[PDB]
Structure formats: C-alpha cells, structure tokens
Subunit: 397 residues, 3 copies
C-alpha cells in the first residue's frame, strides 16, 4: 500500500513541478526520485482487471530516464516527461481500481489485487517516499499498532433509523405518551409527547429518555444542542407498530424541562451538560443519553387552558423535543463524512463495473448496512479501499 502511494505521490509532484521554464534546482530532488521509480519499475509486467466488467490490462515498463543538465526546463523536456507520466498515471489508476473492488473475509488488511501483491515485494521498496497524507499516515501507524484518528466534519455515525415507542398505549390510540426519533447521519432528533399533557402524572411532570449507542468511539467532538425538534412539530398520520392501523399525532410544543445530556464511555459518564444549549464539547464517548421532561404549566392564560383539558378527548398533544448535531469529531476508524469523497469513490467504481456482491461488504456498499454491523472484518476492508481511493484521487479526480 505504501509503495502504491508513492508512485502516485511522485506522479502528482511530477505533474505540478515539471513545468516549462522552471529552474532545475526546483525539481532536482524530484528528478532523482522520478528516475529511481523508472529504474525500479522497468522490466516488470503487471496484470490488472478481469473482475466484473473491469477490463484486463497488461502493463509493461520500458522507459528512459529524464535528463539532469538543463538550467531551466524547456518545452522539450516537459514533453518527454509527460509521456512517461501518462503511462504511469494510467497504471496507477488501474491498480487502484482493481484494489477497490475486492475484499476478503480472512485478511482484509492485506492487498487483494495481484498488482498490489507484486508491489509489496522487496525490490520495489526503493520507490517508497514521503508518506504525509492523512490516510497514508494512518495506514502507517496502524501497522505499527499506534494510535490513529481521522477527523470528520459531520461524521456519518448514526445508521438511519426513524421510529417511535409508545409508553402508554390504547387501541383507540387516542391517549398516548411516547417518544419519536430520527437518527440520520450526524444528527439526532428526539421528541417526547403526552396526549394527556401530564394532568394525571405524578408531580405534573413527565420524563422522557432517548439512548443512542454509537458503533465506534468518538473523541473531541463539537456538537450543537437545540431545544425542540422541527421534525416532530407538525401534525402527522402515522402507521402503527403492528402495522394494522394508523394513529393521529397533533402536537403543541412546550419548552423541554430539566434537560440533561450525558456522554458515556463504558457506562461512566464522561461529560454531562444540564440546561445547556448551543455548542458543547464531548471529549470521549460511545453512548449519548438525552433526558428531558414535560412539565404542565402551572399558570395558563385562557387560550392555553383551552388546549389542555381534564379528560379526553384531547385535540392537541403536548410535545417536547431536542436536536443534537455533531459538527466535527475524531474517530480511530474510517467513516463516511460530509466533506470527504471516499465512499462515493469506492461505491462508484463498484457500481460502474458491475462488481458482484462480495462477502465482506453489504450489497451496493450501502452505508446504513455497513455502519449498522460494522465488524472488525468490515473495518479492515473499509480502510484498505478508502486509502486506495484517496491515493487514486491524487491522480484521477
């Protein structure tokens, strides 16, 4: 993997650096590395493709070195360099694509592709240079078994699920207290509702909890908590848990009470925030538990009093909601995120060449399926593909 990165990294620098009219000193070190790459590559045959719709290509390297005598580079020098760069960029691109579409249950980390396997051989190690990328650096650390972290803006950590639970239920479905939620992407929305409005409830208060457990630990996250949920604040007709019938939800929205958010790792509270809205920091967590309460208003003006009356039927149902978004976090595992293009790159290559379903990855490379049962085997496989995708993007965007 490291060797493949360097081939790309060199080719990229060669493209940026070798420009007509530039001083030789600017590119002298680069010319040496580029040449060393040609010497190592030369005389080897590489075969890629033949899986799915991906064509089989044979790659042959027999190139001359670049000159080291000009003071400033010229159009001639640049043209010669380009021909070598082009053939090389194409090979790397293909080697990457071939890697991207494979997976192994037993040894996910090891390179699947024949071309990648050949490179990881001893002779080629010379090509290796300058592994400064966030993905390569992380790749290097993992082999040494050191700590690593990827930084995500809007981490994609919550598999999509929308649901509700009815804490008190009737067939009439006319006097219900339950929470409903959406967890999608980096955003959690939780709503607690009482049809009664807690007129019965001891202390006149109703207590709701949502607990969300993440697949992977997150560190140094930045999050926003907002009182209320926009999503669950409008009237809906809702299909039913059994699936038999449909209830009706009509809400009136009251400020949540006695809110707490707890961020827990192994069930020790690490961070706890009470009645705090806006940006908050959770340093380390694997679970979030949100607690909020519905409190009946002790004093009501006349219009309010009409809304909540002492016995059914109740027209308007009291709801309290929270919204939590993780803006950025750090993970020790790769995840899809808003900014990065890796899931998109891997998914697209697989889609285009009609790769058949593979044991390691859910069909279509669906994120929700993948994040839902994100096993160690999947994690190994995901990183190897992601790194190659990153490598590929250096050259082919």
């Amino acid at each position: 993997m490291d060797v493949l990165y360097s081939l790309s990294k060199t080719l990229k620098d060669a493209r940026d650096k070798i420009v007509e009219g530039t001083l030789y000193s600017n590119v002298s070190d680069l010319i040496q590395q580029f040449n060393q790459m040609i010497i190592t590559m030369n005389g080897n045959e590489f075969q890629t493709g033949g899986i799915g719709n991906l064509p089989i290509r044979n790659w042959n390297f027999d190139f001359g070195l670049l000159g080291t005598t000009l003071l400033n580079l010229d159009a001639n020098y640049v043209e010669t360099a380009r021909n070598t760069i082009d053939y090389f960029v194409d090979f790397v691109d293909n080697v990457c694509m071939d890697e991207m579409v494979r997976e192994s249950q037993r040894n996910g980390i090891a390179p699947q592709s024949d071309s990648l396997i050949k490179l990881s051989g001893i002779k080629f190690k010379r090509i290796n240079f300058d592994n400064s990328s966030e993905y390569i650096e992380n790749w290097n650390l993992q082999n040494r078994r050191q700590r690593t972290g990827f930084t995500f803006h809007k981490p994609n950590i919550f598999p999509y699920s929308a649901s509700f639970t009815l804490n008190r239920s009737q067939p009439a479905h006319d006097n219900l207290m339950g929470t409903m939620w959406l967890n999608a992407g980096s955003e959690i929305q939780v709503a607690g509702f009482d049809y009664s409005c807690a007129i019965n409830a001891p202390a006149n208060t109703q207590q709701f909890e949502h607990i969300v457990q993440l697949r992977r630990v997150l560190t140094t996250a930045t999050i926003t908590l907002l009182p209320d949920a926009e999503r669950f604040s409008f009237p809906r007709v809702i299909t039913s848990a059994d699936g038999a019938t449909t209830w009706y939800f009509n809400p009136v929205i009251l400020r949540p009470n006695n809110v707490e958010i707890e961020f827990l790792l192994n069930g020790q509270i690490i961070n706890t925030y009470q009645a705090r809205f806006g940006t908050i920091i959770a340093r380390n967590f694997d679970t979030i538990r949100l607690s909020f309460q519905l409190m009946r208003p002790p004093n009501m003006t006349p219009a309010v009093a009409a809304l909540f009356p002492n016995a059914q039927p109740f027209e308007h149902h009291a709801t309290v909601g929270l919204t939590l978004r993780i803006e950025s976090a750090v993970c020790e595992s790769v995840l899809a995120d808003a900014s990065e293009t890796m899931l998109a790159n891997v998914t697209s290559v697989r889609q285009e060449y009609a790769i058949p379903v593979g044991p390691v990855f859910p069909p279509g490379m669906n994120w929700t399926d993948l994040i839902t049962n994100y096993s160690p085997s999947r994690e190994d496989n995901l990183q190897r593909v992601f790194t190659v995708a990153s490598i590929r993007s250096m050259l082919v965007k």
Copy 2:
C-alpha cells in the same frame, strides 16, 4: 495566469520559509527561485487599475538579490528580504484585483488585464514554478484539454426557486392536489399534497413527480434523502399563480409511498434508489427525478378517520414530502460552494470599487442569475476570475 500564480507562490513560501535563525539549507532552493524572480522582474514597468474606482498604480522593479552565504539566517537578512517581499506582494495583489474585475464576451479565458497580458509574454516564463494548487492544476489541465474536476462540499448547484404546480384546481381553491418545492443551494425539498386525500383516486393512490435538471454534470456526489419535508409541513396562506387571490394550505403528513429517486445522464437512468433513506451515492448525473405516492390508509383509528372525510369541505390536507441534500460532489466546472471563498472574493472586489455592469456577468455578480444561464462564455470568465481570486488569497486574506 501560470506566471502570476508563481509570483504569489514564491512570495508565500518566502514569507513562511525565510524566518530568523533558520538553516540556509532549508531555504537554499527557495532563495534561488526568489532571486530568479527578481532578475526576471527587474527593469519592467507595470500599470494597473483605472477601471471603476480602482486607482491607477505604476509599478517599477529595481531590487538587489538576496545573499547566499549565512549558515543560519539572521535578523538582518530577514529585514532586507521583507522589503522586497512587501513591494512584490502589493503588486501581485493589485494585478489580481485588476484581473478580477474585467470580463470579455469573445475571449473569456485569455487574461483581460494589461499587467497579466504583459506577464504572459515569453521572457517571464522563467519565473514559473510549482503549480500544485487545485485551481492552478485545473487551469493547466484545461489548456491541455484534459479532464478536470473541482470538489465541492455543498455544491451550489440549484438556482433558487420556490414554486408550486396545481394538478387539480378550483376557483374556490378548496379541493387541490399539487406539488410544491424549494430548490436552493444544494438542497431540494419536494412536497405532494391532496385535499381529497385520494379517496376518489383510482387505487386509492396518488402519484407525484418532481424533476430537477442541473446546469452542469456532477460526479461521485454524496447525498442524503429524508422522508418528509419540514418546510411544507406547516399551515400557510399562499399567493396564487395568476396573482389574483390567495389559497389556504393546511397539511397533515403521511409517509410517502413507493419512493424512487433516479439519477439520469442524457436520459438514461444511471442510478436508481427505491425506498432508501440516508446516504446514497450518485456516480454520474445531470437530472434528478423524484417519484413518490400518496396512499390513503386502509385502516384508520377514530381520530384519523375524522381527519379525512368523504366529501368536502376538507379541513386537513394530506401531504407527503422528500428532502434531498447533496453533501459533496465533483464538477468539471467551477461552482460556488459552502466551504470556498471565491464568489465572495470576486463579488467583494467588484462591490468595493464600484465596477460598472459587464456584459459577461449578471449585475451584482448574483449567483442565481449566473447559475441559471451558465453559458460557456460565463464559464470561461468565471474560472479565470476564480483562479486569480485563489491566487490572491495565498497572499492577501
């Protein structure tokens, strides 16, 4: 354009690299390039400005080289270097600003500015070095007619439009089925509504479609699909298509049914997703067609049954909605996006110097106007300004 980039790129590196107490070896290659820039620049006169409120400046270069003999740099060396760097940073800044405010219908790609025209002359080519930026690299590829892509987080691709269509209409405006939408930025929201609730409708089902066509093709995009639209879920009084009268919309929200999203390029479906929510990938597309259906509930509890009754008047109107956001994509054309600062930079310079309206660009450099009729002429002009803006930001943020 390439020469201008290097002037900037050198000046930037000179600022980062030439610091007091540093080893000469660290900056030796840089000193050579910096000096070469001084030799090339020296003896030339450049004139900029005089368009709008932008002042006319005359630029004269007569500077000595930097020394190459110290072991570690010192306060003296740094002070001398700074004076040259300052004059140079100012010139570049101005040359850029002068470029930013001009445009041509006939030859948008070619540099408009007198200063930029002079630089693109043969002698100056020597200054050229190290074109590694995403904007410069893309600039280089386009001249060679190779494939290019810019990567956007939250691409700004949908011109702002909010509208509705009434599929069934009455002057009473009391029994209406129609879709309403918002397309803004990277976000599409579509809502389908039936006042009847489809009690009449064949199969008890009502089918809605929204088709959105983008101005430019997008590749390897990451998108979120969420059932329901928050925007169209609350009651509104709406002005009317003729503009004569106003209707009333009151919605009750039901899960959309038989949802499909299709991503099409030249009217071949490239990607199709059915009943899938959360993150999905569209590898290549120029059109999105969203299809969803409204299905009357076969079974209704008593409160639900009250909501939809067999003949008018109907108090509550059934609605089904979708939300689609493109988190990140790749385009072969420049676009405004959430992260980048180029539209802001170009627009601000034009605003500040009171540049008169130009044929190529809509007045005020408005994005919606620009994206709405994003012609080849505009695209050429947009990139040249954007690259200069990027160049300028290296030095002047």
Copy 3:
C-alpha cells in the same frame, strides 16, 4: 511559540519523510534540520505539569545525531530515528498541554508555561523553521502588527439566545404582535407575528425588524437567506416574559413582504439586499438588520377568509419569517467553527485534567459565555491556546 511550532513541524516531517528504502536526497535537508534540533535541544532540562491533575514530568535531552551516508534508507536507520522522534513527540505534546491549560489576565499573548518561556530564549531560535500553517502564519503577522484573517466554514459567531419581544401585549395574551428569534451558531432565524393579521393596521401592513450585532467584524462572508422560518411555524405554548403565565401561539404562514437585509459597519450600510433569496455576499459587516413586513391579503378565497376575521377571538395568527445562515466568512479573530477542532481540543484537555477555573476564561470554557463578552484579554488568551492546540494536532491526533 514559533520555536514550539518548528519542533513539531520537524517531528511531523521526520515521521512522513524518513521511511525505509527512501533515497537520501529526499530527506537530506530534513536530516540537517533534525540534527540541528538535536544539537540545540541537547543538554537542557525542561519541566512541565503540576497544574490540576496534570502530572509533573522532567525532560532530559541527550541524543546522537542521525547518519548522512546511506544511499537509500534502511530498516536500521529508521529504527534509530524513531526512538529520538518518540521521546521528542512526547515532550512536545506535554509542552503543548501545559500551555493549553493556563491563562493570564495581564499578558495573555506571552507564553504562560515554564517550558515555553525557556524555549523563547535566544539559543533555541536556531530550531526555527518553515512557519507555513494558517495558525502560525497568523501568529507571526500579529506580532508584526499586520493584517490577519482566519477562514471559517460556518463561523460560530452568534451566542446562543432564543427570545421574543411583544410589541403589543395584553394580559389575556390573546391579541399579540411580536417577533421571536433564535440566534445560534452561524444561523439567525427571525419570525414576525400578528394575531390581528393587521386588519386594523395602517396601510394594512405590519413592519418588523430584527437587529443582530456581532462581537467581531466579518469579511467576504457567504450567506443564505430563505423566506420563512421553519422553527417558528408550528404551534407552541410559551412561558412568559415575567415568567408568571403562558401564552399560546398558533401560526399561519404568509410570504414576508418588502424584505431587506442590511449589512452595516459602524452604522453605514455596506451591503443592502432587497427581495433577494439564495446566496448573497456581505463583504464587510459588524451588524445585520433584517426588515420584513406583514401584508394582509387584499383578495382571499373562502377558506382563507375564514382564517382571518374582523374581531377577536382570532384562532390562527399570521406569521412571516426569515432564515439567514452564514456558510463561510473571514475573521481577524479566532472563532470556533464547524470544521476546526480547536475548541474541542482545548476544552477537552482542561476537562480531563480537572483544571480549576481561571480568571481569563469562563468556567468549562463555554463558547456562549466566551463569545458573549469576548474581550481583548480573552482574545489574546484564546489565540495562544488555539495555536498550541493546532501545533499539538500536527503530532497528536
């Protein structure tokens, strides 16, 4: 601060660059800098920690140089290098953490930590190299008193506040016109409501204003304006300004009228946008004033007419709303933002070692408290911690 940056910067490059099998030419300049760092460091003792729960560590440097004779690096060379790199990475990490947790009212900019104070001494200046980071570059400019800017995606500029004002009020709280808002993060939402619907109002029109004043000036921002506010579009029971009673808000939503947004700096309008939605640019501002009007519909279909009737009670209350998000801006002061991880890093270190409350910073390092009274003293302190946090992230993520 500059010296600390370089120690880190060197160590980072040493980790990326010194890899087995690489050509010596690739790392020769680096080896020279790395060695120079060892020579400067050697023979000095540094003590860190002892504040809060942070352990006291003693640091001793006595290391040999790296060899300069191999053609390509080998496993041996790499292993030797790593041992030096490790001890060094640990020290830097600790020096940073020690810096992060301190603050001074009197001299915020100067380094608080004993280790940092020792480094800023004359002998160590030699280590200094290559200050190219956005944070370090900004640090350098500020000392020279030059202009600086940080670029934020989703700047965190509005302290969280949710409120309302009642322009016309009754104890009944049954005929009210008032605005309500949320300002959180980079997002401003404003809603104007009339229970009457302006049937009384002169010209049949009702005019609302929201004025928001930011703590720091912002330049070249990109913003989205959307008609309507999702947040205030659903019915709520609201506690009351006195806190005594609760009113009831039920809204019907009408398009805002005669919208203007003004961006002002020192109370001169810099940018003014009328009836413009979608992306707009504000080049320079310290205040936003949003103006919108509620206009009674001259023509109403029968269902609409029912909604607004001539005398109380009024069931449905007319509302008009605006949403404004700043996607990206530039500030001359550091701010928390969606992408960056600095507030999270500083906050987490303080949380973990149980640092006692400090005079400069609000307890818990809360952003809303900090942004609300963002004094010059806080700003000085915030930057020094932020730069160290950035430095630390180079090495320890």
